[PDB]
C-alpha cells in the first residue's frame, strides 16, 4: 500500500532515493553524513556557519538572485544541522522538479562563500549564540551531551564555541566543505509527486560531479537562581541506530508532576542518549526525580501487558503520523539512507512493534536502565536537585 521507496546509486555514490505519491508538491532534499561529530575542535562551528553561508549565493547564481529563483516558483528553502547529519531541503510543486534539483546541486557544490558575507554571518551566528543561551532546554540538552560524551566528538555542540565562530575563515570552511561533502556520503531524497526515473536523470545531469564514542555517565550543573523555572535532563546510554531494541525502547517511552515531562531516545552511530527532560519549579524538583526514577524501575520490574499494548498503539500512531506529509517522509528517506543504508518500510516497523511483548520490554529496560550511571544536566534553581549518589541510588531498587 505505502508508496515504495525506490532508490538508485550513481557512480559518485550519491544514492538517489524517491518515494512517489499523488500529492502535487514535493520535498526534495540532500542529506549529508556530516555534523559536529566529524569536527576536530579546531573547526567546531564549520557546519553551522556553512549552513548559514549556503543560501547567500553561488558561483553560477551570485547572491540574492539565487533566492530570487526560489521565490519565483514559490518554493520553500530550509536547512538544518545535527551532530551527525546535515540537510538542505526544498518544498516545491511537482512541475518545478528539475530547477529545484539544479538549485540543490549549486547548494552542495559550486557554492560560493563570500568574505563579505562571512563577517555578516559571523555577527548573525555570534549574536544568536549570545542570545541562544535564552533557550533553556537547548542549554540543558547541550549540558547533557557535554557531560555524557565527554572526550568524544559527539559531545561537541553544533553551533560551536563563540571562540571558533569568530576564528573561522573561508579556507577552513572550504576544507569542511571539501572534506565532509563527499558523494558516497550523500543522499538525494524525494517525497511526493515525483517520478523516480526523472529524478535519477536529473541527478545524473546535475550532482553527478560531487567528488567511536564513550558515555561518561557523569553530571554537570549550572546554578542560576534568578531564573523562574528549572530544566533537568537525565539520560542513560542508548543502543544506536542499527540495534533493533530501539523499537522496544520507543514503546517504553510511549508508556511514560513536572510542568513539562518529555522522554527522548536520541540515536547516533552506535551510541545515544535515552532519558527524560522536565522543567520545574525549584521546590518540586526532587519529587519529580523520585517520581521519574520509580517509573523507570517499574518498567524494569513490573511491566504488564496492558501498558505495553498502549505503548505499542502510541508508537504506531506516532510513526504513521511521522510518515505522513512530504517533508517528514523525505526527511525519513534521507535519514534512513544515511543511517540504516536502506529505507525501512512501515510494514517492517509494524512487525517489529507487534513482536514486542512485556517480558522482552522489561528485559531490555533492565539492560539499559537498571543499575546504570546516568548523565544529569540541570539549569536554573537546582539546589534541591539531588546530587549524584541519590540519583544513582534511585537507579535501582532494594526490593528489585
Amino acid at each position: 500500500s505505502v508508496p515504495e521507496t525506490q532508490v538508485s546509486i550513481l557512480d559518485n555514490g550519491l544514492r538517489v532515493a524517491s518515494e512517489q505519491s499523488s500529492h502535487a508538491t514535493c520535498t526534495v532534499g540532500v542529506w549529508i553524513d556530516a555534523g559536529s561529530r566529524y569536527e576536530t575542535e579546531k573547526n567546531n562551528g564549520a557546519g553551522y556557519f556553512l549552513e548559514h553561508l549556503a543560501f547567500k549565493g553561488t558561483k553560477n547564481r551570485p547572491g540574492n538572485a539565487l533566492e530570487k529563483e526560489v521565490e519565483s516558483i514559490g518554493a520553500h528553502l530550509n536547512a538544518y544541522s545535527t551532530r551527525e547529519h546535515t540537510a538542505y531541503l526544498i518544498k516545491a510543486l511537482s512541475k518545478d522538479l528539475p530547477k529545484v534539483v539544479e538549485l540543490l546541486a549549486d547548494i552542495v557544490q559550486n557554492s560560493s562563500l563570500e568574505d563579505s558575507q562571512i563577517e555578516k554571518e559571523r555577527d548573525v551566528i555570534l549574536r544568536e549564540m549570545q542570545e541562544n543561551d535564552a533557550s533553556m532546554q537547548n542549554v540543558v540538552f547541550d549540558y547533557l551531551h557535554a557531560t555524557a560524551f565527554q572526550g568524544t566528538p559527539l559531545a561537541q555542540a553544533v553551533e560551536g564555541p563563540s571562540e571558533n565562530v569568530r576564528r573561522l575563515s573561508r579556507t577552513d570552511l572550504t576544507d569542511y566543505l571539501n572534506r565532509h561533502y563527499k558523494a558516497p556520503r550523500m543522499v538525494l531524497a524525494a517525497a511526493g509527486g515525483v517520478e523516480h526515473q526523472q529524478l535519477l536523470d536529473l541527478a545524473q545531469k546535475h550532482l553527478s560531479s560531487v567528488s567511536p564514542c564513550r558515555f561518561t555517565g557523569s553530571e554537570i550543573r549550572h546554578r542560576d537562581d534568578a531564573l523562574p523555572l528549572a530544566h533537568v535532563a537525565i539520560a542513560v546510554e542508548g543502543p544506536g541506530w542499527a540495534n533493533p531494541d530501539n523499537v522496544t525502547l520507543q514503546v517504553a517511552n510511549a508508556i511514560i508532576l513536572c510542568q513539562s515531562f518529555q522522554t527522548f531516545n536520541i540515536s547516533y552511530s552506535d551510541t545515544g542518549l535515552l532519558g527524560a527532560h522536565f522543567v520545574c519549579d525549584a521546590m518540586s524538583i526532587d519529587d519529580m526525580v523520585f517520581f521519574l526514577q520509580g517509573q523507570w524501575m517499574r518498567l524494569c520490574t513490573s511491566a504488564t501487558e496492558s501498558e505495553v499494548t498502549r505503548g505499542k498503539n502510541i508508537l504506531r500512531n506516532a510513526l504513521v503520523s511521522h510518515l505522513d506529509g512530504t517533508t517528514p517522509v523525505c526527511e525519513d528517506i534521507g535519514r534512513s539512507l544515511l543511517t540504516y543504508g536502506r529505507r525501512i518500510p512501515l510494514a517492517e516497523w509494524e512487525s517489529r512493534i507487534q513482536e514486542v511483548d512485556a517480558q522482552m520490554l522489561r528485559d531490555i529496560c533492565s539492560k539499559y536502565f537498571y543499575d546504570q550511571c546516568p548523565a544529569v544536566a540541570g539549569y536554573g534553581p537546582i539546589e534541591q536537585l539531588p546530587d549524584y549518589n541519590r540519583i544513582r541510588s534511585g537507579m535501582f531498587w532494594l526490593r528489585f
Binding site: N132, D133, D142, A146, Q150, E159, P161, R214, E237
Partner: peptide, 24 residues
C-alpha cells in the same frame, strides 16, 4: 553562549565500554 566553555577532563580521577562497566 554556554557552548564556549568546555567540560574539564577528570581522566586523572577517571579510572580504567559496557564490557568494563559490568566489572567496574
Amino acid at each position: 553562549s554556554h557552548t564556549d566553555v568546555k567540560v574539564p577532563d577528570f581522566s586523572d580521577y577517571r579510572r580504567a565500554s559496557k564490557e568494563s562497566s559490568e566489572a567496574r
